[PDB]
Amino acid sequence: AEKMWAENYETTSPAPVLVAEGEQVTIPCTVMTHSWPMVSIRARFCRSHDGSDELILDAVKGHRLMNGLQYRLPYATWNFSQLHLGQIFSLTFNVSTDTAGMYECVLRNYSHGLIMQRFVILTQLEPALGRYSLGDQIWSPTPWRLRNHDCGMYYFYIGRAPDRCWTVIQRYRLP
Amino acid sequence: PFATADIAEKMWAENYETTSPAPVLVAEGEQVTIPCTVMTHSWPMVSIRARFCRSHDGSDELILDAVKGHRLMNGLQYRLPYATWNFSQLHLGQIFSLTFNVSTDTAGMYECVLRNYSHGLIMQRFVILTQLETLPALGRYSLGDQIWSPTPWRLRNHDCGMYFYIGREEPDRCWTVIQRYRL
Ligand SMILES: *[C@@H]1O[C@H](CO)[C@@H](O[C@@H]2O[C@H](CO)[C@@H](O)[C@H](O)[C@H]2NC(C)=O)[C@H](O)[C@H]1NC(C)=O
Ligand SMILES: *[C@@H]1O[C@H](CO)[C@@H](O[C@@H]2O[C@H](CO)[C@@H](O)[C@H](O)[C@H]2NC(C)=O)[C@H](O)[C@H]1NC(C)=O
Numbered sequence: 001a002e003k004m005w006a007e008n009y010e011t012t013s014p015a016p017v018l019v020a021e022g023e024q025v026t027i028p029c030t031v032m033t034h035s036w037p038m039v040s041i042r043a044r045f046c047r048s049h050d051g052s053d054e055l056i057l058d059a060v061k062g063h064r065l066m067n068g069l070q071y072r073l074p075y076a077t078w079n080f081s082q083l084h085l086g087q088i089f090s091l092t093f094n095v096s097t098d099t100a101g102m103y104e105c106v107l108r109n110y111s112h113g114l115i116m117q118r119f120v121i122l123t124q125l126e127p128a129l130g131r132y133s134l135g136d137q138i139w140s141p142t143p144w145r146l147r148n149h150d151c152g153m154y155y156f157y158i159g160r161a162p163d164r165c166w167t168v169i170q171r172y173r174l175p
Numbered sequence: 176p177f178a179t180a181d182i183a184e185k186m187w188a189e190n191y192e193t194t195s196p197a198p199v200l201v202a203e204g205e206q207v208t209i210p211c212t213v214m215t216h217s218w219p220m221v222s223i224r225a226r227f228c229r230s231h232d233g234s235d236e237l238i239l240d241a242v243k244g245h246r247l248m249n250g251l252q253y254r255l256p257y258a259t260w261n262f263s264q265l266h267l268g269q270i271f272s273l274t275f276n277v278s279t280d281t282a283g284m285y286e287c288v289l290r291n292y293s294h295g296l297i298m299q300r301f302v303i304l305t306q307l308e309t310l311p312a313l314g315r316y317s318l319g320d321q322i323w324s325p326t327p328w329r330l331r332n333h334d335c336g337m338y339f340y341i342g343r344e345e346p347d348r349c350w351t352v353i354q355r356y357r358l
């Protein structure tokens with residue numbers, strides 16, 4: 001469906017975050033009160049898959065209209081808060097190779113999506129590494145646990161506590 | 176001890192003015208919340224920092240431990256004795272928020288701040304107004320800088336007393352921030 005990018009899309013979309021397998025995460029969304037009827041979180045997995053997939057909610061009382069993720073992410077949970085001056089919604093799931101990708105916040109009608117912001121969750125990536133620097137540097141929430149194979153299946157990654165992506169990834173620098 | 180005490184050495188996020196929404200005119204007593212959400216970071220503490228429009232100078236902060244989110248210091252307890260905050264751990268980031276009921280007395284400029292004791296990094300700024308000066312169509316939020324309202328249709332208007340409000344000597348400490356944006 002005819003997609004549009006918010007004025008400040010690339011400049012409030014953090015850089016990729018390398019995350020440990022099995023880590024639980026949440027894609028958080030916040031939009032200022034707005035005229036669209038529906039919001040969705042849109043996922044373009046890095047591993048298998050093509051096209052995209054969306055959890056879609058009624059923009060207002062937040063009901064689930066449609067759950068594209070229900071398959072890859074059978075065990076995720078979403079939330080929806082009414083703040084009056086705006087709304088928060090969110091998708092919570094445990095990260096795997098199978099579920100690392102590009103998650104987006106989308107304002108939505110039937111024909112069109114306005115794309116607010118983009119998260120990129122990686123579990124392996126093809127060297128100092130911080131928690132988030134404002135600015136474009138692949139980061140991690142737990143950089144100190146960062147290991148490194150020369151193999152196929154755990155390429156850098158986070159220790160025990162091409163991609164549909166490499167291009168997006170290749171945009172940003174590694175520290 | 177510990178009032179007055181604005182942030183000693185403040186810094187602004189690269190994208191501060193360009194992810195700070197315009198002012199939102201809001202009905203008195205509406206209960207609104209202030210968000211934030213930052214991405215896992217290196218600072219020990221976070222704060223929501225408030226500079227009210229009507230009587231108060233310097234600033235006031237709710238301060239939470241950056242990690243499990245406990246309250247370390249509540250500058251707001253006074254003007255906003257009845258507010259509640261929440262803190263969410265998302266792993267790749269955190270959401271924290273201040274919820275209160277808006278009044279003339281408590282409309283101002285609220286900020287999301289990353290914080291040690293000497294410094295604050297200021298992430299983004301919300302401006303909540305209850306009256307707005309006039310010496311007029313109004314939407315819910317347009318991306319871009321146009322004073323908006325979440326319920327524009329409800330928009331009433333007087334001449335001057337306590338200016339546009341919302342239905343059912345000197346200036347503001349805000350008129351300058353407000354004056355930046357277009358109506
Ligand atoms: C989808 O959003 C678009 C843009 O907000 C709407 O369609 C554009 O809107 C302007 C204002 O009406 C028009 O001048 C353009 O011609 C529109 N384009 C099209 C193809 O319609 C539209 O209203 C929204 N979708 C629905 C289903 O209402
Ligand atoms: C301001 O907030 C207060 C409470 O935080 C609201 O009143 C409460 O509403 C809740 C939800 O229904 C009730 O559980 C409480 O019993 C109420 N307490 C009081 C003291 O009213 C109030 O509605 C909010 N302001 C407005 C204008 O609605």
Ligand SMILES: *[C@@H]1O[C@H](CO)[C@@H](O[C@@H]2O[C@H](CO)[C@@H](O)[C@H](O)[C@H]2NC(C)=O)[C@H](O)[C@H]1NC(C)=O
Binds near residue numbers: 292293
């Ligand atoms: C509070 O944060 C500030 C800013 O990030 C820290 O000040 C920096 O510290 C580094 C390491 O000492 C210096 O090289 C920079 O000159 C400082 N930058 C600025 C802008 O001040 C500060 O050390 C932290 N404070 C405390 C008390 O831990």
Ligand SMILES: *[C@@H]1O[C@H](CO)[C@@H](O[C@H]2O[C@H](CO)[C@@H](O)[C@H](O)[C@H]2NC(C)=O)[C@H](O)[C@H]1NC(C)=O
Binds near residue numbers: 022023024094
């Ligand atoms: C990943 O998510 C699954 C379920 O979606 C979690 O499943 C358990 O272990 C947790 C850690 O100790 C406990 O907090 C839960 O109570 C427990 N759940 C049940 C039903 O017993 C799993 O924990 C998550 N991954 C990790 C590393 O915690």
